[PDB]
Amino acid sequence: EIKELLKLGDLPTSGQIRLYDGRTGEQFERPVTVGYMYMLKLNHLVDDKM
Amino acid sequence: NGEPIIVPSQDVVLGLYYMTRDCVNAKGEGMVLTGPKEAERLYRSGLAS
Amino acid sequence: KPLVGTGMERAVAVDSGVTAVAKRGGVVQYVDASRIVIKVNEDEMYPGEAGIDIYNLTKYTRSNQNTCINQMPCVSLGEPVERGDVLADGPSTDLGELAL
Amino acid sequence: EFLKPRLVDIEQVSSTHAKVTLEPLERGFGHTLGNALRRILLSSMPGCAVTEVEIDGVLHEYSTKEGVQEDILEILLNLKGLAVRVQGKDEVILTLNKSGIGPVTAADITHDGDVEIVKPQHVICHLTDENASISMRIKVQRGRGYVPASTRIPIGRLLVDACYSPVERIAYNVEAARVEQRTDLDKLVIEMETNGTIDPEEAIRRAATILAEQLEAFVDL
Amino acid sequence: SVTEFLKPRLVDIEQVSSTHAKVTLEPLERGFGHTLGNALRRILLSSMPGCAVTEVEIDGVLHEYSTKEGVQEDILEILLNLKGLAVRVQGKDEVILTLNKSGIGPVTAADITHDGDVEIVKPQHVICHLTDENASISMRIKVQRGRGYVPASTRGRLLVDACYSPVERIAYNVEAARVEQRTDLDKLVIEMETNGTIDPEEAIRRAATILAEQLEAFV
């Protein structure tokens, strides 16, 4: 089902795309897994621990 | 014990294992080089894997 | 909101006392950052007591962990609402869904 | 002798984003120029972000005004992403006045002839009472980069973080150019998104000027 | 004052043996170290006018895998030692050098036919040892001019990987330096070697010149 939903859009079914280095403009080899993940910010702030 | 405690952990070893490896047919196989420096120039310029 | 959820977000956000849930279905008479006035429907109204549902939202007050709890209206003026409909979004909520 | 590049074409494929072409380029200069210009374009260009706001009856941004559906904080968050083109000044002050039910777009800012709002559909807030008014002063100024309100710190003056950067996205690619009856040459196509406040060719010119002026450190013309 | 960037000045040049050097630039704008370093690295590695030794013609051996009597090392090391032959030439593009020798002892670059405008910057660069006296060596090496690195694969002739660019290693490293009241400014540290044809500062200056003249249609 995930592959079918990827193919509905124009994304690659492998889930891994081609990226380029941000500061040398050079293609990384080895297609890397990019996607959207739900990130949380826990209540352990460094300005309360220092 | 005697063993070191400054062994590289996980990303360093992955990098050195990917870097020091061999593929049975990669770009720019089977040419002769004059030293490490020419190997590095070949790799950076893109002319070899 | 999450792009990938489990469908359990709506229940968790509605069953806690952070949102402002429409007691009786009606038509949104008036909206504001602090107040919502809902004109109740004839089918759902008592014999007397024409009445209207007034929800006072909870602006920037303090929680036990010194965080901020704040209710934002999510309805707009002149809109239908049924029973069990989220009118204001509490903290970590997005149109009724839990959003952490 | 290297063949020098030229600004062959500027396809303004929309108001938002455009497509510049550079041609002709030698072996290996396409990627070099493309990446250097991408970094300069994405990092350091001048913009005209909003800096300060005064709402009339407001003290702090954690407050609520009567008859507006928005918290003052989210009014600020909507102003923080407002596009504008200050023409001939470093700093200007715009003014918004509105009364009556309805949205409050950017088209409701007093005209202030020596500026230009690029997107007049940008909605700031929603007035929800006929006898309810909003009146604010919005301070715009030219700058570079990102400077939060804290790093640059009366009792009604609401600072907003300033994001003086008109470019959202820079992509580029090099592709072969059958030009001069000669193969083995490149053409660099640069697609660039914007908030609409910097013409693409001037952005390219400014980036090239920056790169050359930085290269002056260890050369002598 | 939004166009007032930070202009560096070469804080030092830690000179080492004449072909080796380490330039350092401080203080650069946030993120300009990497763009400047990468642009210079690419220009210095992949595009530099220089002179190399493209072809060689041993009189006897036709095929790439055979042997001479009298030399302990086979022809592969001969080609490698030729790739180490740094050369300078004037406006002429290609010339035919020749090295005829016979007798015991090494064959360096100090006995190639010195005639012509060409010169060799390492006359003591040993090309090949002879372990006999009756064995003779006769070569005919074609130098040429080019703009980077051109392997033999991309092309009794013997092909040699022509390395035109004078730099043998270029490496930058962006550090963190601070002007009095700003946290994040860069510090570029170029370190590089060459084959002695041009000292490193000349190479860096020429690369920057090439890029600058490339950016004349915009500024």
XYZ file of C-alpha atoms in Angstrom:
639
model
C 0.000 0.000 0.000
C 2.861 2.395 0.760
C 4.383 1.693 -2.655
C 1.006 2.225 -4.333
C 0.565 5.563 -2.560
C 4.097 6.558 -3.558
C 3.285 5.674 -7.165
C 0.102 7.765 -6.998
C 2.405 10.709 -6.555
C 5.471 10.917 -8.769
C 7.864 9.712 -6.086
C 10.203 6.710 -6.411
C 8.805 3.519 -4.920
C 12.171 2.702 -3.335
C 11.657 5.599 -0.917
C 15.249 6.751 -1.483
C 16.129 9.733 -3.670
C 19.331 11.308 -4.942
C 20.872 14.073 -2.811
C 23.683 16.556 -3.375
C 26.245 17.870 -0.920
C 25.259 21.306 0.310
C 28.772 22.774 0.342
C 30.566 20.897 -2.453
C 27.692 20.405 -4.898
C 28.716 16.753 -5.185
C 26.259 13.890 -5.513
C 26.335 11.473 -2.624
C 26.415 7.902 -3.874
C 24.067 5.364 -2.308
C 20.505 6.823 -2.650
C 19.427 7.970 0.808
C 16.120 7.639 2.635
C 14.406 11.025 2.885
C 10.871 11.565 4.107
C 8.654 13.282 6.638
C 8.841 12.333 10.314
C 6.914 13.674 13.294
C 9.432 15.266 15.675
C 8.679 16.124 19.302
C 10.426 18.707 21.481
C 10.753 17.232 24.960
C 10.782 19.396 28.069
C 14.501 18.957 28.835
C 15.871 22.336 27.791
C 19.591 23.032 27.990
C 19.014 26.493 29.465
C 17.367 24.786 32.454
C 20.203 22.249 32.870
C 23.248 24.522 32.629
C 43.652 -4.750 30.408
C 46.230 -3.592 27.882
C 43.860 -2.843 25.039
C 43.276 0.740 23.833
C 40.286 2.857 24.804
C 40.620 5.367 21.935
C 39.362 3.004 19.223
C 37.005 4.771 16.757
C 33.404 3.955 17.614
C 30.749 3.715 14.889
C 30.735 6.387 12.155
C 34.503 6.508 11.813
C 34.666 2.735 11.407
C 31.824 2.784 8.879
C 33.663 5.449 6.899
C 36.964 3.567 6.961
C 35.187 0.333 6.018
C 33.424 1.914 3.050
C 36.605 3.709 2.001
C 39.004 0.740 2.306
C 37.068 -1.802 0.267
C 36.996 -3.230 -3.258
C 34.358 -3.598 -5.963
C 35.014 -6.180 -8.645
C 34.387 -3.671 -11.453
C 34.327 0.023 -10.530
C 35.015 3.173 -12.515
C 38.661 3.628 -13.440
C 39.656 0.060 -12.624
C 43.068 -1.299 -13.509
C 45.188 1.803 -14.047
C 48.632 2.464 -12.574
C 49.282 5.349 -10.170
C 52.369 7.179 -8.917
C 51.316 7.484 -5.275
C 48.586 8.324 -2.773
C 48.394 11.934 -3.966
C 47.474 11.003 -7.529
C 44.913 8.546 -6.152
C 43.309 11.349 -4.161
C 43.322 13.711 -7.141
C 41.761 11.023 -9.337
C 39.034 10.422 -6.770
C 38.221 14.070 -6.014
C 38.221 15.136 -9.667
C 35.745 12.318 -10.342
C 37.818 10.127 -12.676
C 37.800 7.031 -10.437
C 35.682 5.295 -7.824
C -1.075 17.701 12.879
C 0.735 14.430 12.127
C 0.825 13.351 8.508
C 0.937 9.742 9.739
C -1.363 9.063 12.672
C -3.447 6.170 13.973
C -6.938 7.699 14.088
C -6.807 7.785 17.897
C -5.958 11.508 17.933
C -9.526 12.810 17.738
C -10.686 10.713 20.690
C -7.747 11.723 22.888
C -8.188 15.406 22.105
C -11.977 15.414 22.553
C -12.061 13.265 25.695
C -9.720 15.603 27.589
C -10.792 18.983 28.906
C -8.605 21.181 26.701
C -10.767 21.821 23.641
C -14.103 23.638 23.763
C -16.741 21.210 22.501
C -20.177 22.328 21.321
C -22.718 21.232 23.920
C -25.716 21.724 21.611
C -25.728 21.984 17.842
C -26.439 25.366 16.362
C -25.195 28.235 14.224
C -22.146 30.302 15.161
C -23.570 33.685 16.127
C -20.276 35.370 17.008
C -16.567 34.531 17.154
C -13.662 36.223 18.904
C -10.263 35.280 20.302
C -11.849 35.165 23.780
C -15.526 34.290 23.211
C -17.774 32.135 21.040
C -21.549 32.656 20.928
C -23.627 29.867 19.372
C -27.287 30.293 18.433
C -28.968 26.995 19.308
C -31.361 25.273 16.886
C -35.119 25.087 17.360
C -35.157 21.275 17.330
C -32.593 21.263 20.172
C -34.065 24.028 22.361
C -36.041 23.908 25.598
C -39.650 25.212 25.778
C -38.628 28.445 27.481
C -35.156 29.942 27.769
C -34.439 30.960 24.182
C -30.821 31.047 25.201
C -27.480 30.803 23.446
C -24.331 28.851 24.231
C -21.476 31.131 25.316
C -18.011 29.587 25.523
C -15.353 31.712 27.194
C -11.938 30.593 26.020
C -8.873 30.278 28.242
C -6.161 32.679 27.101
C -2.516 32.741 28.107
C -2.641 31.198 31.574
C -0.122 28.963 33.305
C 0.055 25.181 33.658
C 1.559 23.130 36.475
C 4.773 22.651 34.462
C 5.053 26.415 33.752
C 4.092 25.854 30.117
C 1.367 27.890 28.407
C -2.214 26.727 27.844
C -4.164 28.804 25.351
C -7.384 28.214 23.423
C -7.720 29.399 19.826
C -11.090 29.526 18.014
C -11.167 27.222 14.995
C -14.707 28.033 13.794
C -15.549 31.128 11.742
C -18.543 33.437 11.788
C -21.851 32.103 10.506
C -21.024 28.386 10.389
C -23.080 25.311 11.363
C -21.976 23.181 14.305
C -23.355 19.856 15.525
C -23.002 18.323 18.966
C -19.548 17.102 19.903
C -17.860 19.553 17.525
C -14.617 21.185 18.622
C -15.017 24.976 18.592
C -11.715 26.042 20.189
C -8.358 24.274 19.991
C -6.526 23.840 23.277
C -2.753 23.456 23.466
C -1.257 20.840 21.156
C -4.466 20.527 19.139
C -5.228 21.210 15.465
C -8.870 21.275 14.312
C -9.685 18.738 17.001
C -6.803 16.381 16.300
C -4.031 16.006 18.867
C -0.805 17.639 17.631
C 2.225 17.242 19.895
C 41.405 30.615 -23.640
C 38.152 29.885 -21.819
C 34.835 30.886 -23.366
C 33.163 33.318 -20.996
C 29.526 32.954 -19.875
C 26.731 35.369 -20.760
C 23.174 35.996 -19.559
C 21.513 34.476 -22.603
C 17.908 34.264 -21.409
C 15.637 35.013 -18.453
C 12.407 32.996 -18.555
C 10.027 34.577 -16.029
C 7.883 31.450 -15.825
C 5.780 33.090 -13.101
C 5.659 35.989 -10.674
C 7.113 33.790 -7.936
C 9.982 31.886 -9.577
C 12.116 32.394 -12.678
C 14.641 30.512 -14.812
C 17.929 32.180 -15.777
C 20.342 30.702 -18.332
C 24.120 31.108 -18.543
C 25.943 30.081 -21.703
C 28.541 28.909 -22.877
C 30.644 27.232 -20.162
C 33.719 25.025 -20.389
C 34.339 21.601 -18.862
C 33.818 21.624 -15.113
C 32.993 25.316 -14.741
C 29.249 24.685 -14.838
C 29.171 22.915 -11.482
C 31.646 25.338 -9.896
C 29.705 28.432 -10.927
C 26.359 26.827 -10.146
C 27.250 25.815 -6.605
C 29.053 29.054 -5.752
C 26.151 31.131 -7.049
C 23.643 28.901 -5.257
C 25.393 29.431 -1.930
C 25.703 33.194 -2.364
C 22.110 33.547 -3.588
C 20.632 31.441 -0.788
C 22.764 32.899 2.002
C 23.289 36.648 1.535
C 20.863 38.807 -0.434
C 19.182 42.010 0.793
C 15.512 42.068 1.703
C 12.916 44.331 3.307
C 11.461 42.312 6.176
C 9.146 43.808 8.785
C 10.864 44.702 12.067
C 8.413 46.339 14.494
C 4.670 46.749 14.967
C 2.511 49.062 17.058
C -1.125 48.054 17.493
C -3.123 50.877 19.001
C -4.561 49.389 22.198
C -2.029 46.596 22.719
C 0.730 46.360 25.331
C 2.311 42.954 24.687
C 1.962 40.204 22.104
C 0.436 37.712 24.589
C -2.782 39.740 24.644
C -6.141 39.640 22.886
C -7.777 42.551 21.083
C -11.553 42.815 21.084
C -13.438 42.106 17.871
C -10.551 40.397 16.046
C -10.555 36.622 15.672
C -6.744 36.492 15.911
C -4.448 36.515 18.888
C -1.991 39.392 18.602
C 0.810 36.830 18.444
C -0.616 35.221 15.310
C -1.201 38.660 13.796
C 2.538 39.175 14.206
C 3.258 35.726 12.768
C 1.225 36.703 9.701
C 3.090 40.007 9.400
C 6.461 38.262 9.723
C 5.929 36.702 6.277
C 4.856 39.860 4.431
C 6.566 40.751 1.152
C 7.362 44.359 0.262
C 9.760 46.365 -1.935
C 11.069 49.513 -0.268
C 12.333 51.452 -3.263
C 14.650 54.284 -2.232
C 15.148 54.136 1.541
C 16.784 52.052 4.246
C 13.793 52.294 6.615
C 10.116 53.224 6.223
C 6.950 53.061 8.331
C 3.713 51.813 6.775
C 0.289 52.217 8.390
C -2.820 50.024 8.343
C -6.296 51.222 9.296
C -9.461 49.168 8.930
C -12.953 48.949 10.386
C -15.894 46.664 9.723
C -16.409 42.928 9.405
C -14.191 41.014 6.997
C -10.593 39.988 6.341
C -7.714 42.462 6.533
C -5.433 41.868 3.557
C -2.158 43.600 2.789
C -4.047 45.728 0.252
C -5.441 47.655 3.253
C -2.071 49.221 4.118
C -1.926 52.949 3.421
C -0.323 53.279 0.046
C 2.846 55.221 0.971
C 3.809 55.940 -2.610
C 7.520 55.022 -2.423
C 6.962 51.323 -1.592
C 5.182 48.344 -3.151
C 3.321 45.428 -1.583
C 3.920 42.450 -3.856
C 1.082 40.135 -2.748
C -2.123 42.046 -1.851
C -4.026 38.825 -1.055
C -1.877 38.164 2.041
C -4.405 38.064 4.889
C -3.261 39.356 8.283
C -6.391 38.974 10.418
C -10.197 38.765 10.431
C -12.351 41.488 11.959
C -15.598 40.012 13.277
C -17.720 42.937 14.466
C -19.151 45.856 12.514
C -18.104 48.493 15.079
C -14.606 47.077 15.515
C -11.439 48.706 14.217
C -7.762 47.872 13.890
C -5.046 50.481 13.441
C -1.328 49.732 13.461
C 2.049 51.091 12.421
C 4.386 48.602 10.718
C 8.105 49.379 10.505
C 9.918 47.994 7.450
C 13.656 48.250 6.866
C 16.325 46.810 4.608
C 18.698 44.181 5.920
C 20.558 40.956 5.260
C 20.243 37.446 6.642
C 18.331 36.585 9.809
C 18.529 38.590 13.035
C 16.096 37.514 15.777
C 14.398 40.131 17.921
C 16.493 39.137 20.940
C 19.914 39.685 19.347
C 18.940 43.269 18.407
C 17.098 44.297 21.589
C 8.396 52.027 25.117
C 5.636 49.695 26.348
C 3.714 49.115 23.107
C 6.545 48.318 20.699
C 6.305 44.679 19.570
C 9.517 43.496 17.934
C 9.232 40.712 15.363
C 12.065 38.510 14.152
C 13.364 39.872 10.853
C 14.107 37.551 7.932
C 15.668 39.838 5.330
C 15.986 37.194 2.609
C 13.884 37.205 -0.601
C 14.928 33.742 -1.880
C 13.201 30.509 -0.855
C 14.729 27.980 -3.264
C 17.650 27.779 -5.694
C 17.997 24.764 -7.965
C 20.322 24.507 -10.933
C 21.565 22.072 -13.541
C 24.188 21.966 -16.281
C 23.238 20.548 -19.669
C 24.955 20.242 -23.038
C 24.759 23.151 -25.488
C 24.983 22.404 -29.215
C 26.460 25.853 -29.828
C 29.184 27.315 -32.072
C 29.155 24.231 -34.350
C 31.136 22.643 -31.545
C 30.346 20.012 -28.927
C 31.818 19.693 -25.431
C 30.248 22.794 -23.889
C 27.798 23.448 -21.070
C 24.788 25.612 -20.266
C 23.796 26.397 -16.681
C 20.065 26.750 -15.977
C 19.126 28.229 -12.589
C 15.555 27.974 -11.303
C 14.930 30.315 -8.382
C 11.888 30.919 -6.189
C 11.336 34.259 -4.497
C 8.769 36.172 -2.494
C 8.602 38.458 -5.552
C 10.778 41.276 -4.196
C 14.031 40.827 -6.163
C 14.266 40.605 -9.939
C 16.259 37.442 -10.832
C 18.895 38.967 -13.129
C 19.790 41.558 -10.503
C 20.132 38.748 -7.958
C 22.549 36.946 -10.283
C 24.508 40.159 -10.861
C 24.760 40.861 -7.133
C 25.891 37.310 -6.364
C 28.561 37.477 -9.067
C 29.727 40.836 -7.713
C 30.003 39.361 -4.216
C 31.984 36.368 -5.470
C 34.389 38.522 -7.485
C 34.933 40.979 -4.629
C 35.729 38.054 -2.331
C 38.121 36.608 -4.920
C 39.982 39.933 -4.938
C 41.648 38.940 -1.637
C 44.253 36.646 -3.259
C 44.540 37.944 -6.829
C 45.573 41.254 -8.413
C 43.868 42.519 -11.568
C 25.309 49.124 4.530
C 23.965 45.712 3.498
C 26.618 45.303 0.775
C 29.480 45.824 3.266
C 30.826 42.283 3.586
C 34.065 41.275 5.350
C 37.245 41.447 3.262
C 40.081 39.165 4.451
C 43.849 39.494 4.137
C 46.292 36.617 3.945
C 47.170 36.282 7.616
C 50.234 34.189 6.773
C 51.888 31.849 4.269
C 53.621 29.110 6.272
C 56.204 28.435 3.599
C 57.671 24.926 3.531
C 59.831 23.292 0.818
C 59.482 25.389 -2.326
C 56.739 23.231 -3.869
C 54.652 23.081 -0.654
C 52.766 25.831 1.154
C 49.882 26.653 3.493
C 47.882 29.852 2.989
C 45.414 31.043 5.638
C 42.562 33.541 5.272
C 40.902 35.198 8.263
C 38.142 36.379 8.949
C 35.641 35.261 6.293
C 31.898 35.746 6.274
C 29.759 32.940 7.671
C 29.826 30.221 5.022
C 32.153 31.874 2.504
C 35.089 29.661 3.454
C 33.496 26.590 1.914
C 32.411 28.241 -1.336
C 35.789 29.911 -1.895
C 37.705 26.771 -0.967
C 35.622 24.472 -3.146
C 35.730 26.799 -6.153
C 39.508 27.091 -5.903
C 39.860 23.335 -5.371
C 37.820 22.500 -8.465
C 39.616 25.050 -10.641
C 43.053 23.917 -9.454
C 42.268 20.209 -9.904
C 40.263 20.103 -13.143
C 41.315 23.159 -15.195
C 44.862 24.546 -15.246
C 46.990 25.382 -18.312
C 50.062 23.203 -17.969
C 52.550 21.021 -19.817
C 52.696 17.232 -19.527
C 54.248 14.148 -21.170
C 51.451 12.526 -23.159
C 53.074 9.837 -25.338
C 56.275 7.791 -25.310
C 57.815 5.622 -28.044
C 60.224 2.923 -26.946
C 62.040 1.745 -30.063
C 61.899 -1.983 -29.314
C 58.763 -2.954 -27.387
C 55.602 -2.432 -29.439
C 53.041 -4.004 -27.084
C 52.288 -2.620 -23.624
C 53.381 -5.845 -21.815
C 56.933 -6.953 -22.671
C 60.472 -6.587 -21.292
C 63.894 -5.056 -21.953
C 67.176 -6.731 -21.224
C 69.340 -4.642 -18.916
C 66.693 -2.781 -16.856
C 65.452 -4.414 -13.666
C 62.049 -2.657 -13.750
C 59.530 -3.357 -16.518
C 58.008 -0.618 -18.673
C 55.142 0.177 -16.281
C 57.571 1.776 -13.844
C 59.154 3.537 -16.834
C 55.842 5.218 -17.646
C 55.323 6.027 -13.965
C 58.745 7.677 -13.773
C 57.850 9.645 -16.898
C 54.650 10.877 -15.250
C 56.956 12.368 -12.605
C 58.830 14.400 -15.235
C 57.889 18.020 -14.560
C 58.349 20.135 -17.687
C 58.112 23.765 -18.801
C 57.602 24.929 -22.394
C 57.030 28.272 -24.107
C 54.336 29.113 -26.694
C 55.074 25.904 -28.600
C 52.395 23.287 -27.980
C 54.039 19.888 -28.587
C 57.682 18.917 -29.080
C 59.556 15.641 -29.533
C 62.207 15.000 -26.902
C 64.533 12.013 -27.077
C 66.734 10.161 -24.582
C 69.473 7.930 -25.999
C 71.734 6.382 -23.372
C 73.911 3.327 -22.839
C 76.115 2.239 -19.945
C 75.832 1.210 -16.324
C 74.018 3.362 -13.793
C 70.818 5.389 -13.610
C 69.079 7.355 -16.344
C 67.857 10.676 -14.955
C 66.318 13.689 -16.695
C 69.698 15.486 -16.835
C 70.633 13.587 -20.027
C 67.532 14.089 -22.195
C 68.326 16.203 -25.258
C 68.445 19.649 -23.644
C 68.051 21.381 -27.018
C 64.997 23.561 -27.521
C 63.123 25.969 -25.300
C 61.950 23.190 -22.967
C 63.557 22.698 -19.570
C 63.269 20.137 -16.771
C 62.914 21.330 -13.187
C 64.319 18.105 -11.648
C 67.423 17.000 -13.579
C 68.024 14.354 -10.880
C 64.587 12.744 -11.375
C 65.682 9.152 -11.950
C 63.842 7.676 -14.918
C 65.314 4.157 -14.942
C 68.275 2.037 -13.836
C 70.395 -0.036 -16.215
C 72.121 -3.095 -14.752
C 74.414 -3.643 -17.766
C 76.699 -1.738 -20.143
C 75.883 -3.297 -23.535
C 72.165 -2.544 -23.127
C 71.050 0.751 -24.672
C 67.842 2.750 -24.217
C 66.242 4.976 -26.855
C 63.068 6.964 -26.167
C 60.994 9.580 -27.965
C 58.598 11.329 -25.583
C 55.852 13.664 -26.812
C 55.131 16.508 -24.425
C 51.940 18.519 -24.853
C 49.852 21.286 -23.287
C 46.495 20.881 -21.602
C 43.935 21.963 -19.027
C 43.807 19.356 -16.266
C 44.003 15.555 -16.041
C 43.404 13.371 -19.106
C 43.815 9.601 -18.539
C 44.977 7.246 -21.258
C 41.716 5.265 -21.157
C 39.653 8.194 -22.484
C 41.704 8.021 -25.710
C 54.332 1.012 -31.034
C 52.640 3.946 -29.348
C 52.481 3.936 -25.543
C 49.921 6.180 -23.866
C 50.647 7.874 -20.537
C 48.114 9.555 -18.265
C 48.819 13.214 -19.026
C 48.737 15.293 -15.829
C 48.809 18.902 -16.994
C 47.827 20.785 -13.842
C 50.907 21.733 -11.764
C 49.298 20.982 -8.379
C 49.658 17.488 -6.918
C 47.537 18.093 -3.826
C 45.054 20.812 -2.861
C 43.222 20.670 0.456
C 41.266 23.317 2.339
C 39.859 23.210 5.861
C 37.397 25.789 7.190
C 37.983 26.601 10.868
C 36.133 28.931 13.246
C 37.624 32.383 13.879
C 36.014 35.341 15.648
C 36.197 39.074 15.039
C 35.885 40.983 18.309
C 32.093 40.722 18.732
C 30.764 38.168 16.230
C 30.551 34.464 16.999
C 30.667 32.682 13.643
C 33.225 33.791 11.067
C 35.212 31.347 8.976
C 38.950 30.809 8.551
C 40.118 29.121 5.353
C 43.334 27.074 5.465
C 44.584 26.138 1.991
C 47.464 23.653 2.003
C 48.911 22.475 -1.283
C 51.826 20.991 -3.196
C 53.055 21.319 -6.781
C 55.667 19.744 -9.052
C 57.975 22.766 -8.853
C 56.870 24.377 -12.116
C 55.221 27.201 -10.140
C 55.319 27.871 -6.418
C 51.934 27.462 -4.677
C 51.140 31.171 -4.329
C 51.398 31.587 -8.098
C 48.999 28.673 -8.599
C 46.429 30.101 -6.181
C 46.708 33.544 -7.765
C 46.241 32.114 -11.260
C 43.203 30.062 -10.221
C 41.580 33.100 -8.624
C 42.412 35.066 -11.773
C 40.714 32.436 -13.939
C 37.524 32.504 -11.876
C 37.486 36.311 -11.735
C 37.847 36.635 -15.505
C 35.091 34.031 -15.805
C 32.811 36.378 -13.814
C 33.239 39.472 -16.031
C 29.887 39.301 -17.861
C 27.940 39.891 -14.612
C 29.833 42.215 -12.248
